[PDB]
Ligand binder design. Sequence first.
Ligand SMILES: Nc1ncnc2c1ncn2[C@@H]1O[C@H](COP(=O)(O)O)[C@@H](O)[C@H]1O
Ligand SMILES: Nc1ncnc2c1ncn2[C@@H]1O[C@H](COP(=O)(O)O)[C@@H](O)[C@H]1O
Ligand SMILES: Nc1ncnc2c1ncn2[C@@H]1O[C@H](COP(=O)(O)O)[C@@H](O)[C@H]1O
Ligand code: NA
Ligand code: NA
Ligand code: NA
Lengths: 109, 109, 109, 330, 330, 330
Amino acid sequence: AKPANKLVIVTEKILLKKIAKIIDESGAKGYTVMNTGGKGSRNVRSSGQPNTSDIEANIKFEILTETREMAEEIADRVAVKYFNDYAGIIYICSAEVLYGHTFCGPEGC
Amino acid sequence: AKPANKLVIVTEKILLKKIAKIIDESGAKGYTVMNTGGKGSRNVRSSGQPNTSDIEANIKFEILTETREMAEEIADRVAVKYFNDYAGIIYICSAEVLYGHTFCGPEGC
Amino acid sequence: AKPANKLVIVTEKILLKKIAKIIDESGAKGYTVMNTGGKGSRNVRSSGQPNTSDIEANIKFEILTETREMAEEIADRVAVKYFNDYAGIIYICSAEVLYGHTFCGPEGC
Amino acid sequence: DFLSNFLTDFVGQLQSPTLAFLIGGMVIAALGTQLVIPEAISTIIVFMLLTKIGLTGGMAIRNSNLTEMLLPVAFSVILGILIVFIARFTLAKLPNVRTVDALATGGLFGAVSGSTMAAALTTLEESKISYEAWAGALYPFMDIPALVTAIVVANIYLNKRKRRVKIWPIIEESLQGPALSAMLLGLALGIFTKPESVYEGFYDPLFRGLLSILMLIMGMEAWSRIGELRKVAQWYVVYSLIAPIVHGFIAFGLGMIAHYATGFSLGGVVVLAVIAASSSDISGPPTLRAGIPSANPSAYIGSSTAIGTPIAIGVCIPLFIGLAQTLGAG
Amino acid sequence: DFLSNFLTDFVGQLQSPTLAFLIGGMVIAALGTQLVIPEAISTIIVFMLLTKIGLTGGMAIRNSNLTEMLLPVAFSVILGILIVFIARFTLAKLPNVRTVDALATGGLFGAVSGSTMAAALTTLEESKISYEAWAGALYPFMDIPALVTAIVVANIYLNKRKRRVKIWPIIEESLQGPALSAMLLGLALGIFTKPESVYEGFYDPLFRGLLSILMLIMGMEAWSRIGELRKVAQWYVVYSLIAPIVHGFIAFGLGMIAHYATGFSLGGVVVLAVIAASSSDISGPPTLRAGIPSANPSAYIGSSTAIGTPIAIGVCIPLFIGLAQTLGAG
Amino acid sequence: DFLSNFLTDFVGQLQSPTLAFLIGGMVIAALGTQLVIPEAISTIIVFMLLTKIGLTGGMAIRNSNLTEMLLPVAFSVILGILIVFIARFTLAKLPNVRTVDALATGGLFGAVSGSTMAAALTTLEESKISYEAWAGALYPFMDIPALVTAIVVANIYLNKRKRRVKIWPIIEESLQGPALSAMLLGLALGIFTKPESVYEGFYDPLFRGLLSILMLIMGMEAWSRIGELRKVAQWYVVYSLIAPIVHGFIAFGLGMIAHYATGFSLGGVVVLAVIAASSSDISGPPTLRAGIPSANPSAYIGSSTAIGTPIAIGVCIPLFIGLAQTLGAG
Ligand SMILES: Nc1ncnc2c1ncn2[C@@H]1O[C@H](COP(=O)(O)O)[C@@H](O)[C@H]1O
Ligand SMILES: Nc1ncnc2c1ncn2[C@@H]1O[C@H](COP(=O)(O)O)[C@@H](O)[C@H]1O
Ligand SMILES: Nc1ncnc2c1ncn2[C@@H]1O[C@H](COP(=O)(O)O)[C@@H](O)[C@H]1O
Ligand code: NA
Ligand code: NA
Ligand code: NA
């Protein structure tokens, strides 16, 4: 029962290497990535594979931070750098972490 | 910091074409799809591939709407049309969109 | 409009068989699984496939329970059994189920 | 004789591939293996088998007269409609069988398995029986009128019980399926082009080996659908055991009419009988789910996949091949 | 003559594989098929084709003199730079064409498609024209200086309009791509090792058949990118139709200089012309997206994939092969 | 002599496939390539190699006496138990080595790599040394008693330090693994059936080429596990370099007992030595993770994959093959 903020970044698949660098620079303890599909305004993709077989051409990042101010600092760094040229959405929900060794610490939560 | 509602539809994989049509008819700006697995009551599937290699036979839709009334209007249209015959669950959580061009607009959020 | 708790377990891919057993023992009506990637403290994996092609080596469970006390009882059983030796995080968010036959019942929600 | 010919043809096919990989996949799935064939490999195997069948059926069409393939195309359309009408009057008149479940089951048993059709062509080759090379192009002419008839007749019954359906979108979805589009691609490249160099080097030498992997998949499929068959009735077990044999015997009698009239060879009436004995399994149940959503999917998937496909490969292929050794001895 | 030779070479290649599977994939995608080739199969096919090209180009290098491959390597570097500079002064001087979109389009038309290069080697084999076996190793020497020149020149233009770029990380990303790493692996195993046993058994007999599946993929790719081409200009359609022919004619003239000076064979100047006519498709647009993020990706992906690759396979391959029947008749 | 024979056999195998693709995959992974082989392709390759080994080992069993394969089956069970007991008394008696990590490492070095066993059969073929065709069926008789012994002995040690384990579910999980189920399927189809037509057409001509892709994968695997080896000790590097050679020399001495008693051929004692030198890397670490969860997975995966498999393919295969040229010269 330790309160957290769940930041979600949905963007193009090509930015997997660059956004995982930004998360590791901000002091976040980890992240989770999925390959997803979806539709929006900038729907054209180029992933290095054939587009006709590229049904899931997005990534969904999921970052749990202890503070709200850290999760807005990752989102400000991603959206300034890439969201003028790449497709993307960033939203944040509120969660509570029950277990986890690097989040709650060795003391526990 | 623009408040939103996150509608989630988890259903069978065969309804990928029909549910993405309903979302685009309601005025939602976009959606996100994943291939997922899972267990429930109606566990039998038929996806057009061998069932023994079909470990992820569901879709998870994720739709962010500005209004609560729109997200309930997509859910009422899907559950009346398909949820008498197909497997499915629909839930809704609350989120806040920090960035995104077609959601927040060109003005910003 | 029936309130629920969304429990999320992110752990190693090898525990897919054992954690789905624990969820079915607790009285939860179902779950959802994804294959995900991600980074943390215990990053070494062994899934039975080559690690160089194993880009998504985690599972994300998603369990919707009616009561908060049930979702903490699944999380206490998983984290005591496996989280001393395996990688993992468990968090819980709050949701509202709009449709679903085994969750809301035949009466409706 | 007849049953003297059949039993040594039955153990003769168990002592061969294309049935042993069916049994071998069914045994290791019963023993609970974690061996899976990936879904990307299963998609490219069905593409490779059905393109090869299309390339031969079309390298022979441009030499053909297009009147020899008039009565087998007419008879395979009739067989697709008649099989659904047999299940309407026999299976649906049973105690705990819903009528909308029997019409969906008869629609799958009228449709064709490309896995069973490819297993019949390879057994005809190593039994040294000549067949018309365009006989694989009879596959859409039975598969599509059976799925259309099941959807049309069931939707009439649902409106009768309450007290119109668009036929062409059903034909459009069936033509655009991944199995049947690969054959039609092969048909067009056989007729209008000269694909003999890529056929003799790639699609023909890889046929029998890729089929043995698909025989392993269909059979791990069969064991995984047996649990769906415990939840419907015991009359779907009796239907799935004897209806592949009955539908093959009606097709063999219809094939002997074309043999006496246009010279349709005896190896081609075996292709017509096994095609009518097979039940979809993959491309069918997605079409019948959208067309008949009120049907219980444990009824028709459990009938056609768990029993109907091992019966058509295991029993019906050495039965109708051994029947064509009797006729054709003079 | 010349155009008497071309038209019977055009229908001669439509009556053959490697172009029919290109057209056949384009037709079934226009008819709206649900047939997809999985992404795991498309990755291992590009690996298998480019390893075979690398193994031959390197089993011939260790026998070579390394001065015969001095002017074709010098000319294919110049052609990669010149093609981007042609699109700077012709395509970007048009009314509704952005300059940063034309430099990204010219960077893709300077880069090489490995799918088009493999289609040119197989057509040279069954037209019985000998070529240098290391001519496939000219593929990185045009692909990489074209993508570097497009990123460098566009970043100079963006700083001019506002009122430095690291070149070696662009070369490092291009060398580490999955297509070009498979060829360099094959080059190294050809030179330093003796891979003749696995080459004659696996990589060579599976070449023409795996290419026909890749020809099916590239062509379902072409139809899916036509809708991106309605959103840019009508001058990208005129550019993508005639610039593969013009870039091939400049490369053919540069290849005839090497033919008269070092004995570079006429089958090798066809390889040099088709490589300069091809446009990248898969490995290029991810490099130009990171390098030039301000470019509209509907402009250069829609130009190079929807038109530029069917023109290079359909028109440019039987044009420059039929041109090398005229020269070489004495 | 002995070391005169070995060094020209060492460069003789580097100038050949099956080791060059191991080195070639290790070099391009060190240079940081983005080339990946998809997981669907890696699953069907292990299926194709182990089914072929099972089909030969079983087309020879039904001709065999079942007393020639009594002492090699007895000796390969003993070697699986003895290797884990060697690591208990040598590796675990070192300063910064945990005892529960050494028992998990010795369990992987007792288990067998099917990638290394397939590399030893192909090198014996092109060195023209005859071996017993059922020697591939010794693979479960060493793999399973080694993983059972590591789990049983480590769980005894954890209860000793605190102050019972079910053996048959460990054997049930190992028999149901995707690698070992493919071989047992091939064994059963070799004995009870006649699979010679699909074997000579599909599984045998595709063996050496599919192995060269698996040699590329194992080797990109080796470079990705070197970073796990910096976090344990420097004694896992010394163990992983010399224990594949020591376990092969104990197996070669045990194989020479069977050669002098039942006529077990000298090509079969090379198969017994390389199987005893290989470490699992694929099916092993998931079994030892569930059985011994308290072990550090960087210790035994980093030891067996980064060093132990390149040593067994690179050093141990040309050592024990060249040893069997010395014995067998009269
Ligand atoms: N309203 C929305 N709800 C959910 N996901 C969205 C929404 N808008 C955009 N996305 C996701 O964000 C990606 C990029 O959005 P866009 O910038 O509109 O192209 C899309 O492909 C979707 O995956
Ligand atoms: N309580 C639950 N929690 C999470 N996911 C569920 C739950 N119930 C159902 N699902 C998902 O919804 C699908 C269909 O549910 P059902 O209608 O029960 O078959 C399942 O396969 C799961 O993916
Ligand atoms: N702060 C975090 N935010 C999101 N996901 C996380 C976080 N920490 C850990 N994870 C996930 O949990 C897995 C195991 O975490 P760990 O126990 O740190 O290895 C990681 O591989 C991630 O998928
Ligand atoms: Na049928
Ligand atoms: Na070019
Ligand atoms: Na061993």
